[PDB]
Amino acid sequence: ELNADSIPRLKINQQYAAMGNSARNDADGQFIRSNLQEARWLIKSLESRNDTLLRVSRCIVEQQQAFFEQGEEYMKPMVLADIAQAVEMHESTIS
Amino acid sequence: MKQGLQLRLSQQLAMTPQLQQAIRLLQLSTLELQQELQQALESNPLLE
Amino acid sequence: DNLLGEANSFLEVLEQVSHLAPLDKPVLIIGERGTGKELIASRLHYLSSRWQGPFISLNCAALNENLLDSELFGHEAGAFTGAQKRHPGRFERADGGTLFLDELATAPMMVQEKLLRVIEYGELERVGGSQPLQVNVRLVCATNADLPAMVNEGTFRADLLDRLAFDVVQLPPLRERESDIMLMAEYFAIQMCREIKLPLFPGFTERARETLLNYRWPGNIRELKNVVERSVYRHGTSDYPLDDIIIDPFKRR
Amino acid sequence: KDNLLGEANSFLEVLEQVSHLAPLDKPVLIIGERGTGKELIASRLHYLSSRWQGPFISLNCAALNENLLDSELFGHEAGAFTGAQKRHPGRFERADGGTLFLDELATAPMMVQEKLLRVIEYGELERVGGSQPLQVNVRLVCATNADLPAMVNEGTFRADLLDRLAFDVVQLPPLRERESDIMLMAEYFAIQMCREIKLPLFPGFTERARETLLNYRWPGNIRELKNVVERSVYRHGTSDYPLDDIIIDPFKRRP
Amino acid sequence: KDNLLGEANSFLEVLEQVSHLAPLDKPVLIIGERGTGKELIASRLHYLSSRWQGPFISLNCAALNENLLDSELFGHEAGAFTGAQKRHPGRFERADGGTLFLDELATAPMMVQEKLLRVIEYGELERVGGSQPLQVNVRLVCATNADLPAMVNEGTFRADLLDRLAFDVVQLPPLRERESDIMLMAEYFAIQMCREIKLPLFPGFTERARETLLNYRWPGNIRELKNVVERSVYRHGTSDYPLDDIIIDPFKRRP
Amino acid sequence: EYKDNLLGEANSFLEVLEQVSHLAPLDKPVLIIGERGTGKELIASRLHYLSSRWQGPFISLNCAALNENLLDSELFGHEAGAFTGAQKRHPGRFERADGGTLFLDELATAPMMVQEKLLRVIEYGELERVGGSQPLQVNVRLVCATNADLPAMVNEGTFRADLLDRLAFDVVQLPPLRERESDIMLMAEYFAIQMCREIKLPLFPGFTERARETLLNYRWPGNIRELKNVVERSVYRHGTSDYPLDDIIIDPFKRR
Amino acid sequence: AEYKDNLLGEANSFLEVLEQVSHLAPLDKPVLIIGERGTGKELIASRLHYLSSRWQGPFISLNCAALNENLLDSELFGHEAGAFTGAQKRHPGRFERADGGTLFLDELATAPMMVQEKLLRVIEYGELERVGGSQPLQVNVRLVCATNADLPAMVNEGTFRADLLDRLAFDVVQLPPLRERESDIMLMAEYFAIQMCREIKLPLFPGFTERARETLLNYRWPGNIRELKNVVERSVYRHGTSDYPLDDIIIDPFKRR
Ligand SMILES: Nc1ncnc2c1ncn2[C@@H]1O[C@H](COP(=O)(O)OP(=O)(O)O)[C@@H](O)[C@H]1O
Ligand SMILES: Nc1ncnc2c1ncn2[C@@H]1O[C@H](COP(=O)(O)OP(=O)(O)O)[C@@H](O)[C@H]1O
Ligand SMILES: Nc1ncnc2c1ncn2[C@@H]1O[C@H](COP(=O)(O)OP(=O)(O)O)[C@@H](O)[C@H]1O
Ligand SMILES: Nc1ncnc2c1ncn2[C@@H]1O[C@H](COP(=O)(O)OP(=O)(O)O)[C@@H](O)[C@H]1O
Ligand SMILES: [Mg+2]
Ligand SMILES: [Mg+2]
Ligand SMILES: [Mg+2]
């Protein structure tokens, strides 16, 4: 794991969310819903980061062992576009 | 199956480029991304 | 609902169709030129508890853009404003009500096989909207005089059609209930006279009726209505009865 | 007013049948040789029909390619279109309450014809981007020169659709068959050309010209009359004296 | 006006017929043989036509692709499809009432005639999904290096396409038929070649060359004559050369 | 155990099953000489039961009907090429089950190029792709079945001889419905039980001698399709009848 | 360096062909193989690619008969854009597979005349045909060929142009017939039997019968491929628990009883 322990993986307050869900004021409920949408966006961001890390790890391991065994002087050229194509993700995203 | 410029199929997807998505990428800011996430979580109500 | 032919064999078939209407089993029957079995089944569904449900009938002859699965689930998101005014899809309209299918003989055999597979699985999914389907709403189809020999000939997949319908509606003979066909012709003539603002029915010669028997009505009610309409229009008057019967609209003079 | 020729007794029966068809809003087909002008007859009938002030659609058959109904016929005024989404008018939708004439409908795709017939019989627009299909009171008309009796038997068109598409189909008598409006059309065209070519007057068709016209097979019918007028345009060079032989066949070669 | 007249009786009659038809704006067809030059004759007629101060622009008929026949007929309004660049200039729209001299009419495919069927009607420029068709009466004219009546017998073209020609098909006589200005035409072509070959003067090859041409079939009526003259000049490359032993048989192989 | 579908009591059927078990232990191409309506993946089901990938079921699904261009697309699918978009290897025949055994049917309709692709599949060969290079190599065994004698087609030059030979490593002949005579009664009883279960019928109420005679006189082109139709007709009739009701037959067309 | 496993046989023709392949290995010229069906000409071509090409040179085995649509065959030449339904991404790769390597094909008889002519107009000059509008690439790719039909036979048929047939056939490598080899055939059969015994993971020796050898001699075996040997080894595999098998089945439909 790419420092999975160091990964934040922070989550919103479920108790406060329940309080926002139980908010009597309609405007307060709407604000709580907006905060929940922002929290869902953050969760999606974290999940995307983790997935990108895992995919990059797999793509590297596809050839990293070959480079490690062959040696530094026996290093094959690596293309960012080729790596992205192998991972099938966006090339700019990989860059 | 080699005709050119035939009837165009309806697009069923969008780029949907959002500055939120780019910040989510964070260019893999790592510890910097952690600090930014902490700052946002502080700015985000009912977070952590 | 509306006046319909009442041949004895047709009466038995209508009774069977009404009995089957309460069950939501899929419907797919071959159709003659006159057809009307589809209308009878629709009336039966109206009589059954399936009434007040959706009655989306798509004549499967026009495909827009990719269609196919996109036709099956028309809820497509992206390349738009982010909100769709009304994009339920063929499956969604089929869900919760009767789903009649037409123009199916010319529809792609692969499309039919996929629809039959989805009839059990219900693996509906689309960018705009997805659903596990399995709505259990009754389905109907128009085989359009499909030949089982064609399945044997391989034009259409035999399994794809067999899994679609375990039972079908038989076709009553056109020769049966010839006298009642005269009554239907009279009713249609009265309807046209009301539509054409004609004074009244001037009558019909018995020789013309016998000639109608000779024509044998190849299109059944479909041919009969057109023949009666042509006879009325060529009559152009309601003073005396008509003693001329036109077998075909095409004629030489 | 708009109607032309019609002096024939068979043409009189045709006018009577047109009056009868006016009572019935049901669509019909006009049959005639090349250059018949039965399309103009249908247009004049539509003008004399219930919608005295109404639209008309020329809608030639071979004008839409690789396009469904909602590209030019039904239209895509709604959004969510393929690629870019925008308003797009439709001829079939726009012509409702008017006339939707089909120019040479016999030369249309067979499967597309079947789909169009299925739509028309059902009376539902369907298409995409619309909440309700509704129905259209546009006058559906058709006029060509081909004979459907053979094409349908050959599978060039759907037989059931053709029967449904056929209600009061009538075939006009050939102009060569009539052989009466020859002089009338000749005089009318001579006046029209003399006004057009600024000629002082019609030179006139001599007895030889009349005999040639009588003997003319006239395959083009009214188009053959137009060809006769075109030949007289050469005889306009002979406007000083009566035209001896107005009739000419372009296929033959002079000298 | 930059065309060398045939300066012959048949050529003079053809020019006279062209001048007579010049004010007339009705559709035309040319049945001149191979190497006629009607590509230039019709252009000069358009220069002398009624719309002399009019925008005249011809276009190749068979050149249009099979996929985009509608696009060639009229530019798609870009409401649908991937195209998002408004409406392309339609054929009638590109003509804009001017001369659109049709070349290579014989080689068009069936769909081309199907589109022409609508094009037969006056104006009515209906784009892909447009609001309403526009009337653009443009001077129509055609030519056929092949035999159009023979095509009609074969049925490759449409009968309405035959009806498209409103005037008589002017035909050019064969090079064997005319053989009148062959000497003068050869002299002019030789002068033009010598100007091109950077020779102030050169004895033209006409001694017994007129007899040989009289014995020649000369399929390349206008072209191959000057072509052979220039070829012989290039082969000789000399001015002080008698008009003898000059011949061109490019297809044939010398020993 | 795969529910032991279509348990054929015939000794020839048992020998074919043993041979199929041997082939499933192997991972090499094998030919199944079948006929229409006969052995419709039942042998394939047995092979999956005895497959080396017993835990991971193979793709199977040999039966397929498609156009020539459609079959070619099923062979090679790229996102950019062809009409469909954003889906490369949409068929994914090898992608359906890694290893296992690729299963094919109606190879007679396959074109010469299609037959050549099949041959390259039979040996160690790369994947088919419309564009680019397909160095991707997915090992998977081969299974196929057609109702015709491909020796004649090769003699007629309608299929690649190399494909016909290499594919025909070991032809698995199949018995048709006409072959099954004594086991027909057992198959009928099993179908009756299955229909009674599926149609919620209390049980198989019983057969009639006239019904058995009619079934024997029936051509019965399908090994189970005829049995399936007979069972369906009997279930529909006897469900209301609660009795043998003589013979119930299913006809596409009914008169009088 | 590394040698691919090959069947052992006393076939001086095979050794001479190998020596000729070695001689042409430093050479970079077109090579044509007269291999008939099942002669394993592909294996010989690959062995050449080991030595005839530069070490670790790119190789590609594309059969023109395998081509489905001639439009796709055009797509086999690189398309820049505006081709087919989707012109978003276009990379034929065949020329890329060609670049820095040799070209190997089998049964080049079936090609359309236009395909062969384009192949000539590409190979002889070295430029690459592009389906989309682009400057052609002079990709340095060798060409190796292997077909059953006689080149003069097609010349009489006229399928290959004289220029195309000539520039296509620079060197001739006749593949020895399987029926031609008799003793080498037996030795290769024994070697393939040993390899099959290893593959089947059966410790017991396969064993053979004299009548079986006589029948195999009777068998035409037009294809020298391992496939015919594999069929023989499968006929052996149908027998088990015996040290030396007896008899064999020509075909599974054969001897159905
Ligand atoms: N029993 C009936 N009673 C009244 N009208 C009928 C009857 N059967 C047929 N018709 C008329 O005949 C026509 C047949 O139409 P349709 O069922 O669409 O034919 P098809 O299904 O063969 O296309 C209908 O428009 C209907 O008005
Ligand atoms: N009723 C009529 N009276 C006089 N001329 C007519 C009449 N109908 C048509 N024409 C002439 O015939 C031609 C009409 O051809 P067109 O309208 O294209 O016929 P079609 O019905 O074959 O399409 C014109 O030259 C027109 O003047
Ligand atoms: N009267 C003329 N004077 C000079 N050149 C002519 C004349 N008529 C035709 N040409 C020559 O003919 C050539 C045009 O070919 P053309 O005859 O138009 O072919 P087509 O008739 O098949 O269209 C031109 O190069 C032109 O020089
Ligand atoms: N000398 C040899 N030693 C071992 N195997 C051989 C030999 N010659 C041919 N083969 C075998 O024949 C099989 C097919 O040969 P070939 O006919 O060249 O293939 P292709 O069908 O592509 O032409 C190969 O798998 C190869 O193992
Ligand atoms: Mg119908
Ligand atoms: Mg020219
Ligand atoms: Mg090979």
Coordinates of C-alpha atoms in Angstrom, one line a residue, chain E residues 59-251:
Chain E
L59 CA -20.2 22.3 -61.8
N60 CA -19.4 18.7 -62.5
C61 CA -22.4 16.4 -62.3
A62 CA -20.9 12.9 -61.7
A63 CA -18.3 14.4 -59.4
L64 CA -20.6 14.4 -56.3
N65 CA -20.1 11.6 -53.9
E66 CA -22.6 8.8 -53.2
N67 CA -22.7 9.4 -49.4
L68 CA -23.7 13.1 -49.5
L69 CA -26.1 13.4 -52.4
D70 CA -28.4 15.5 -50.2
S71 CA -25.5 17.7 -49.2
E72 CA -24.7 18.3 -52.8
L73 CA -28.3 19.1 -53.5
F74 CA -28.6 21.5 -50.6
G75 CA -26.4 22.3 -47.6
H76 CA -27.6 20.7 -44.3
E77 CA -28.9 23.4 -41.9
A78 CA -26.7 21.8 -39.2
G79 CA -29.6 21.5 -36.7
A80 CA -28.8 17.8 -36.6
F81 CA -25.8 15.5 -37.1
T82 CA -22.3 16.3 -35.9
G83 CA -22.1 19.3 -38.3
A84 CA -22.3 22.6 -36.5
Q85 CA -21.4 25.1 -39.2
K86 CA -24.8 26.3 -40.4
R87 CA -26.0 25.4 -43.9
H88 CA -23.6 24.6 -46.7
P89 CA -24.2 26.3 -50.1
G90 CA -26.7 24.2 -52.0
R91 CA -26.4 23.5 -55.7
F92 CA -29.3 25.7 -56.6
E93 CA -28.3 28.0 -53.8
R94 CA -24.7 28.2 -55.2
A95 CA -26.2 28.9 -58.6
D96 CA -28.3 31.7 -57.1
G97 CA -30.2 32.1 -60.4
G98 CA -27.1 32.0 -62.5
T99 CA -25.7 29.6 -65.1
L100 CA -24.8 26.2 -63.6
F101 CA -23.8 24.5 -66.9
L102 CA -24.1 20.7 -66.2
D103 CA -21.2 18.7 -67.5
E104 CA -20.9 14.9 -67.6
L105 CA -24.7 14.5 -67.3
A106 CA -24.7 11.0 -68.9
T107 CA -22.6 9.4 -66.1
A108 CA -24.8 10.4 -63.2
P109 CA -26.3 7.6 -61.0
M110 CA -29.9 6.8 -60.4
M111 CA -30.1 8.7 -57.1
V112 CA -28.8 11.8 -59.0
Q113 CA -31.8 11.6 -61.4
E114 CA -34.1 11.0 -58.4
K115 CA -32.8 14.3 -56.9
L116 CA -33.2 16.0 -60.3
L117 CA -36.9 15.0 -60.1
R118 CA -37.3 17.5 -57.3
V119 CA -34.9 19.8 -59.1
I120 CA -37.3 19.8 -62.1
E121 CA -39.7 21.9 -59.9
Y122 CA -39.3 25.6 -60.0
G123 CA -37.0 26.8 -57.2
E124 CA -38.1 25.4 -53.8
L125 CA -34.7 25.1 -52.1
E126 CA -35.4 22.9 -49.1
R127 CA -32.3 22.3 -47.0
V128 CA -31.9 19.6 -44.4
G129 CA -34.6 20.3 -41.9
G130 CA -35.0 23.9 -43.0
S131 CA -37.9 26.2 -42.4
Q132 CA -39.2 26.6 -46.0
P133 CA -37.9 25.9 -49.5
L134 CA -36.6 28.9 -51.5
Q135 CA -37.4 29.6 -55.1
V136 CA -34.1 30.0 -57.1
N137 CA -34.7 29.9 -60.8
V138 CA -31.2 29.3 -62.2
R139 CA -30.4 28.9 -65.9
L140 CA -30.4 25.1 -66.4
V141 CA -28.5 23.5 -69.3
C142 CA -27.0 20.0 -69.9
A143 CA -24.8 18.0 -72.2
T144 CA -24.4 14.4 -73.1
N145 CA -21.4 12.9 -74.8
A146 CA -23.4 9.7 -74.7
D147 CA -26.7 9.1 -76.5
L148 CA -29.5 10.2 -74.3
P149 CA -32.3 8.5 -76.4
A150 CA -30.2 5.4 -76.3
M151 CA -29.9 5.7 -72.6
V152 CA -33.7 6.1 -72.4
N153 CA -34.1 2.9 -74.4
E154 CA -31.7 1.3 -71.9
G155 CA -33.7 3.0 -69.1
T156 CA -30.5 4.0 -67.2
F157 CA -31.7 7.6 -66.9
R158 CA -35.2 8.8 -66.0
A159 CA -38.0 9.8 -68.4
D160 CA -38.4 13.0 -66.4
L161 CA -34.7 13.6 -66.9
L162 CA -35.4 13.4 -70.7
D163 CA -38.2 15.9 -70.0
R164 CA -35.7 18.2 -68.3
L165 CA -34.3 19.4 -71.6
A166 CA -36.6 22.3 -72.6
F167 CA -34.8 23.2 -75.9
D168 CA -33.6 21.1 -78.8
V169 CA -30.3 19.4 -78.3
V170 CA -27.8 21.2 -80.4
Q171 CA -25.3 18.7 -81.9
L172 CA -21.9 19.3 -83.2
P173 CA -20.9 17.7 -86.5
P174 CA -18.1 15.2 -86.4
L175 CA -14.6 16.3 -87.4
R176 CA -15.0 14.1 -90.4
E177 CA -18.4 15.7 -91.0
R178 CA -17.1 19.3 -91.0
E179 CA -13.5 19.1 -92.2
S180 CA -13.9 22.7 -93.4
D181 CA -11.7 24.9 -91.3
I182 CA -9.2 22.1 -90.6
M183 CA -6.5 23.9 -92.5
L184 CA -7.2 27.3 -90.8
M185 CA -7.6 25.6 -87.4
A186 CA -4.4 23.8 -87.9
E187 CA -2.6 27.0 -88.8
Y188 CA -4.0 28.8 -85.7
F189 CA -3.0 25.8 -83.5
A190 CA 0.5 25.7 -85.0
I191 CA 0.9 29.5 -84.4
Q192 CA -0.2 29.0 -80.8
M193 CA 2.2 26.1 -80.3
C194 CA 5.1 28.0 -81.8
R195 CA 4.3 30.8 -79.4
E196 CA 4.3 28.2 -76.7
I197 CA 7.4 26.4 -78.2
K198 CA 9.3 29.8 -78.1
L199 CA 9.6 29.8 -81.9
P200 CA 8.8 33.1 -83.7
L201 CA 7.6 31.3 -86.8
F202 CA 7.4 27.7 -88.1
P203 CA 6.2 26.2 -91.3
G204 CA 2.9 24.5 -90.5
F205 CA 2.4 20.8 -91.4
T206 CA -0.4 21.0 -94.0
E207 CA 1.2 19.6 -97.2
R208 CA -0.8 16.4 -97.7
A209 CA -1.8 16.7 -94.0
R210 CA -5.2 17.9 -95.1
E211 CA -5.5 14.8 -97.3
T212 CA -4.4 12.6 -94.4
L213 CA -6.9 14.2 -92.1
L214 CA -9.5 13.7 -94.8
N215 CA -8.5 10.0 -94.6
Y216 CA -8.4 10.2 -90.8
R217 CA -11.3 9.2 -88.5
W218 CA -10.1 11.8 -85.9
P219 CA -12.1 10.7 -82.9
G220 CA -10.5 13.5 -80.8
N221 CA -12.4 16.1 -82.9
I222 CA -11.2 19.4 -81.5
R223 CA -8.6 18.0 -79.1
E224 CA -6.6 15.4 -81.0
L225 CA -6.1 17.7 -84.0
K226 CA -4.3 20.4 -82.1
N227 CA -2.7 17.7 -79.9
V228 CA -1.2 16.0 -83.0
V229 CA -0.1 19.3 -84.4
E230 CA 1.7 20.2 -81.2
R231 CA 3.2 16.7 -81.0
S232 CA 4.5 16.9 -84.5
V233 CA 5.9 20.4 -83.8
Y234 CA 7.7 19.2 -80.7
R235 CA 9.1 16.1 -82.5
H236 CA 10.4 18.2 -85.4
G237 CA 11.5 21.1 -83.2
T238 CA 12.6 23.0 -86.3
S239 CA 11.2 25.9 -88.3
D240 CA 13.0 25.3 -91.6
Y241 CA 11.1 22.0 -92.0
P242 CA 8.8 21.1 -94.8
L243 CA 5.2 20.0 -94.2
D244 CA 5.9 16.3 -94.7
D245 CA 6.2 13.1 -92.7
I246 CA 4.1 14.5 -89.8
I247 CA 1.7 12.1 -88.2
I248 CA 0.5 11.1 -84.7
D249 CA -0.5 7.6 -83.7
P250 CA 0.2 7.6 -80.0
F251 CA -1.8 4.5 -79.3

